[PDB]
Amino acid sequence: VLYENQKLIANQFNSAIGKIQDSLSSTPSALGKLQDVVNHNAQALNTLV
Amino acid sequence: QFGRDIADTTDAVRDPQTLEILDITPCSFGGVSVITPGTNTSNQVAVLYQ
Ligand SMILES: *[C@@H]1O[C@H](CO)[C@@H](O[C@@H]2O[C@H](CO)[C@@H](O)[C@H](O)[C@H]2NC(C)=O)[C@H](O)[C@H]1NC(C)=O
Ligand SMILES: *[C@@H]1O[C@H](CO)[C@@H](O[C@@H]2O[C@H](CO)[C@@H](O)[C@H](O)[C@H]2NC(C)=O)[C@H](O)[C@H]1NC(C)=O
């Protein structure tokens, strides 16, 4: 099934790459875990001081 | 007369004699670190300031 539609799956892979490139910056809430851990460390330091 | 920051500490102050703004920052300090190959191999040590 690979070489029957190699151009089609190449175009689909390129479309998926473009879609995920758009979706990574489409919303500012797609990186919630890093923002949460950074804010938790910052708030821990803030309440420490 | 003086300013503060997010830590609610002293970072800037106005002198009572003139009108020049000052800044307060602590000098260099930290925990000292050591690097040694062990007493069973050699005796030279490399002291490190973190
Ligand atoms: C299988 O699905 C893919 C994607 O859903 C189809 O590729 C699309 O085909 C249409 C019409 O042929 C084009 O207008 C689109 O541009 C194609 N998409 C991409 C990303 O190239 C494909 O045709 C489908 N195959 C079958 C046999 O139904
Ligand atoms: C406190 O006294 C000092 C004395 O040096 C004053 O400083 C002088 O003030 C005069 C008046 O403006 C200036 O012409 C001089 O150039 C200043 N000298 C220096 C070294 O700064 C100062 O102004 C006084 N402060 C107050 C609030 O009266």
Side-chain angles (χ1 to χ4, degrees):
Chain A
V1 311
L2 183 63
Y3 317 104
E4 282 189 41
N5 45 1
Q6 191 167 348
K7 210 54 173 44
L8 259 64
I9 65 168
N11 280 2
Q12 205 178 68
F13 191 76
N14 296 325
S15 299
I17 286 299
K19 192 186 291 184
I20 193 66
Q21 179 187 349
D22 177 43
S23 160
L24 183 63
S25 183
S26 63
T27 177
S29 47
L31 277 296
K33 286 293 205 210
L34 281 72
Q35 299 273 353
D36 284 331
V37 63
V38 160
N39 173 50
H40 277 334
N41 175 231
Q43 280 181 341
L45 201 66
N46 264 357
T47 191
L48 188 153
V49 298
Chain B
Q1 289 183 356
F2 52 92
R4 272 179 156 128
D5 269 332
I6 47 171
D8 293 332
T9 46
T10 69
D11 73 315
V13 72
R14 200 74 153 278
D15 43 0
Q17 271 183 354
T18 52
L19 273 300
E20 208 270 330
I21 178 174
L22 273 297
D23 186 74
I24 301 157
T25 42
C27 50
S28 278
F29 80 108
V32 65
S33 194
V34 290
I35 293 296
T36 175
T39 58
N40 218 8
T41 296
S42 304
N43 290 76
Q44 299 322 106
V45 65
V47 60
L48 166 70
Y49 293 94
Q50 264 285 340

